[PDB]
Design an enzyme around this catalytic site. Structure first.
Site, mmCIF file in Angstrom:
data_model
loop_
_atom_site.group_PDB
_atom_site.id
_atom_site.type_symbol
_atom_site.label_atom_id
_atom_site.label_comp_id
_atom_site.label_asym_id
_atom_site.label_seq_id
_atom_site.Cartn_x
_atom_site.Cartn_y
_atom_site.Cartn_z
ATOM 1 N N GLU A 295 -2.920 14.653 15.970
ATOM 2 C CA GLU A 295 -2.771 15.165 14.604
ATOM 3 C C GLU A 295 -3.517 16.480 14.396
ATOM 4 O OE1 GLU A 295 -0.771 14.076 12.306
ATOM 5 O OE2 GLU A 295 -0.618 11.891 12.348
ATOM 6 N N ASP A 296 -3.290 17.419 15.316
ATOM 7 C CA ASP A 296 -3.709 18.821 15.220
ATOM 8 C C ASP A 296 -5.200 19.020 15.380
ATOM 9 O OD1 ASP A 296 -1.109 19.744 14.917
ATOM 10 O OD2 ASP A 296 -1.219 19.573 12.730
ATOM 11 N N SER A 297 -5.918 18.122 16.022
ATOM 12 C CA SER A 297 -7.238 18.495 16.488
ATOM 13 C C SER A 297 -7.171 18.945 17.938
ATOM 14 C CB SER A 297 -8.217 17.343 16.321
ATOM 15 O OG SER A 297 -7.649 16.136 16.773
#
Ligand SMILES: [Zn+2]
Ligand SMILES: [Zn+2]
Ligand SMILES: [Zn+2]
Lengths: 47, 66, 49, 263, 113, 137, 45
Positions: F1-3
């Site tokens: 999730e976009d880390s």
RNA sequence: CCCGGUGUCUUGGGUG
């Protein structure tokens, strides 16, 4: 207590050789505001 | 600002090769060949020298305050 | 605050009731709140800021 | 039963083949050399004067990254384990640097060769700045123009790479095995034909190719591990491989000690 | 501000044992070993070695969270052997193989010197 | 999730490290013909409603000196204002922002267009990438 | 008492509370405090 | 000799 706000060097432990300032000296455990990292550590008076 | 001491990705020392790189460019070598002569073989090390921008030459032009 | 204490967790804007659920606190180093990845959907949360 | 065959060698890198060991042992050797082989590195910088254009901790940060000769570091103690008050001759090396530019023109370049050893352990070959030749000025630290001065005192300490990467005695460690993929540990991505689209390993000629009609050996294990250990000059390449093995021994020894004492 | 001290990965607190053995009484002859201030480096080395022994019926480990330098290993052996003793055997084997390995490298090194 | 996972050793060698600078400005104000604020290190005996932080890093000129590390709520510029009708003044000092720390880098002292004293204190610290910091291609 | 520095000609001098804020040498009205007496330490990390 | 706190109203740019 005439030890507050005076500059200090640590002679034992993992922080040995570092400069600091006594931020709080309630009893036995001091609070040194170590010059290096931006934090105040709890430390025993023997050190 | 000034050439990094180490390659960020692998750690090989590159801070002693900056002067040698500028001299090789005066002699007309191409960038790829200059890096080859300095033995910087992995492309992680190559980015460090090829893409650094030397701003410290600009900051020194400002007359010392003291 | 210590282990197993319940706390109410909440991510704006609260559009429906599962924007506010109670989690159990686990104290950890560093400065972010940690969520198990399967609760991102009801909060409509992600980790882009 | 473990066998070693050194393919190439020089002062700062050893290329070698390792064989008749388990994959896990080859990997643990890789990790130990990167992370746990002690070295010496600057860890405290006392700035008495810095009127250069670089910020104080910026210069201090570069100092920490300078590789120091660490050959005799095994006889040296960690600072955290020494019985003394403050810092002495047994747990630290003291270095000093002083540069200045006189003249109204030109630039004085401050190099790592101006680092002067002042105090250290007696007769131990440690705390010396790494140098390739004798006419090599070394690593650029700063640059000075008229009336700008840099006068610093550096304390170097023994440490390991787990704490901070500046204590790492190695840069990259190249590492590979099974160049023809006989073990089938990878499943190759391809558009048309997998063999033409994937380049050959640089050790493809050290191991014969798989026979077209040859049966799949489901009992074969990885058995030959080619690796190259490059170093920064803080330690010689042969020392790093030797001390990696030595360090890994004491760690296992320490585990063995604790079991026979807990009863 | 909340970063822990990096030296805490390998320095053992005084009130914390390097090693802790507890039983798993749910099945016969099974122990849980908790290793403090250690990594995959140590753990994977011991694990494979142990798995090739005929009297080890189960060995596994997990690093429960990378922000804490510990891991826990589970070891079950058949009725004859005591797990803790078997662990000592695995340790001594690897120390021997590395001693041999260090010797053979030294010899080969002088020839290329 | 976009880390994203960052290599800790790269951070150690200096990747994406940055300097951060903050400047504080203060000046003396005029309230009458000879009623002006005054830069000084305020004595606890003569000045009321003092701040809770330490005053021990100020020099005698009322200004802190470059090179001294400061933490939150420390006073870096001491200034008093007199109380209208001894024990006559009130503190009007400026503390460092509570969430910050660093080193005093440079202190400018001058006068403004109206002729009263005027100071600026620039503080520098270094921000090192850590869990939670944002990045983008 | 307190060391200062002239922003134009770099002359060093001191001032007490009473004196006007200028350089004795050139009259420049922008001045800077000198570096503190205390030693500064950094961890080089 | 305890206790001990300081701002209100608007404008402009962001974050999600
Ligand atoms: Zn590289
Ligand atoms: Zn010592
Ligand atoms: Zn002047």
């Amino acid at each position: 207590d005439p030890t507050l706000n005076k500059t200090v060097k640590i002679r034992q432990g993992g922080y040995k050789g570092k400069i600091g300032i006594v931020k709080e000296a309630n009893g036995d455990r001091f609070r040194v505001e170590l010059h290096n990292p931006n934090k105040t550590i709890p430390i025993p008076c023997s050190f | 600002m000034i050439i990094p001491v180490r390659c960020f990705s692998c750690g090989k020392v590159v801070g002693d090769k900056w002067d040698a790189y500028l001299r090789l460019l005066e002699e007309g070598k191409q960038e790829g060949d200059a890096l080859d002569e300095l033995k910087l073989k992995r492309y992680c090390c190559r980015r460090m020298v090829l893409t650094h921008v030397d701003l410290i030459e600009k900051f020194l032009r400002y007359n010392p305050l003291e | 605050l210590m282990d197993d204490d319940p706390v109410l967790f909440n991510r704006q804007p609260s559009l429906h009731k599962m924007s506010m659920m109670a989690h159990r606190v686990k104290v950890m180093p560093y400065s972010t709140f940690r969520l198990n990845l399967s609760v991102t959907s009801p909060y409509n949360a992600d980790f882009d800021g | 039963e473990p066998k070693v065959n050194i393919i190439n060698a020089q002062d700062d890198e050893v290329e070698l083949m390792l064989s008749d060991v388990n994959l896990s042992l080859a990997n643990s050797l890789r990790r130990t050399m990167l992370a746990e082989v002690p070295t010496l590195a600057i860890d405290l910088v006392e700035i008495k004067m810095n009127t250069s254009v670089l910020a104080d901790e910026f210069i201090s940060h570069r100092l920490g990254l300078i590789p120091l000769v660490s050959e005799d570091v095994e006889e040296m103690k960690y600072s955290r384990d020494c019985t003394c008050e403050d810092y002495c001759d047994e747990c630290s090396v003291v270095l000093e640097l002083s540069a200045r530019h006189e003249g109204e023109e030109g630039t004085t370049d401050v190099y790592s060769s101006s680092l002067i050893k002042v105090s250290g352990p007696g007769n131990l070959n440690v705390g010396e700045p790494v140098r390739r030749d004798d006419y090599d000025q070394g690593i650029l630290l700063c640059k000075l123009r008229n009336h700008q001065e840099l006068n610093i005192r550096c304390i170097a300490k023994k440490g390991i790479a787990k704490e901070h990467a500046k204590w790492s005695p190695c840069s990259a460690i190249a590492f590979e095995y099974d160049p023809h993929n006989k073990l089938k540990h990878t499943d190759f991505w391809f558009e048309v034909d997998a063999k033409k689209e994937w380049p050959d390993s640089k050790y493809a000629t050290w191991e014969e190719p798989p026979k077209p009609g040859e049966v799949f050996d489901y009992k074969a294990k990885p058995n030959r591990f080619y690796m190259t250990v490059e170093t920064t000059g803080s330690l010689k390449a042969n020392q790093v491989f030797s001390r990696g093995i030595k360090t890994l021994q004491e760690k296992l020894a320490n585990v063995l000690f604790e079991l026979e004492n807990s009863r | 501000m909340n970063a822990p001290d990096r030296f805490e990965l390998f320095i053992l607190p005084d009130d914390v044992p390097k090693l802790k053995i507890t039983p798993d009484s749910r099945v016969p002859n099974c122990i849980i070993i908790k290793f403090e201030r250690e990594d995959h480096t140590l753990a994977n080395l011991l694990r494979e070695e142990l798995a090739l022994y005929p009297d080890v019926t189960f060995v596994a480990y997990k690093v429960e969270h990378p922000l804490f330098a510990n891991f826990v290993m589970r070891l079950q052996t058949e009725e004859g052997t005591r797990p803790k003793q078997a662990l000592e055997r695995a340790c001594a084997s690897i120390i021997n193989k590395l001693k041999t390995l260090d010797h053979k490298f030294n010899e080969e090194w002088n020839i290329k010197n | 999730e976009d880390s994203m996972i960052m290599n800790q050793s790269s951070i150690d060698r200096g990747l994406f490290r940055s300097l951060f600078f903050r400047s504080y400005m203060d000046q003396e104000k005029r309230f009458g013909i000879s009623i002006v604020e005054e830069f000084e290190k305020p004595t606890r005996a003569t000045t009321l409603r003092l701040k809770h932080g330490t005053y021990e890093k100020l020099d005698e000129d009322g200004l802190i000196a470059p090179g001294v590390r400061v933490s939150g709520d420390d006073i870096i510029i001491g200034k008093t204002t007199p109380i209208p009708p001894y024990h006559t003044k009130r503190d009007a000092s400026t503390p460092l922002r509570s969430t910050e720390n660093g080193i005093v880098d440079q202190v400018l002292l001058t006068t403004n267009q109206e002729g009263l004293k005027f100071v600026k204190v620039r503080m520098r610290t270094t921000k090192v990438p850590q869990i939670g910091d944002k990045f983008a291609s | 008492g307190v060391k200062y520095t002239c922003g134009a000609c770099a002359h060093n001098f001191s001032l007490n509370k009473s004196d006007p804020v200028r350089c004795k040498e050139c009259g420049h009205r922008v001045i800077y405090k000198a570096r503190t007496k205390r030693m500064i330490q950094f961890d080089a990390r």
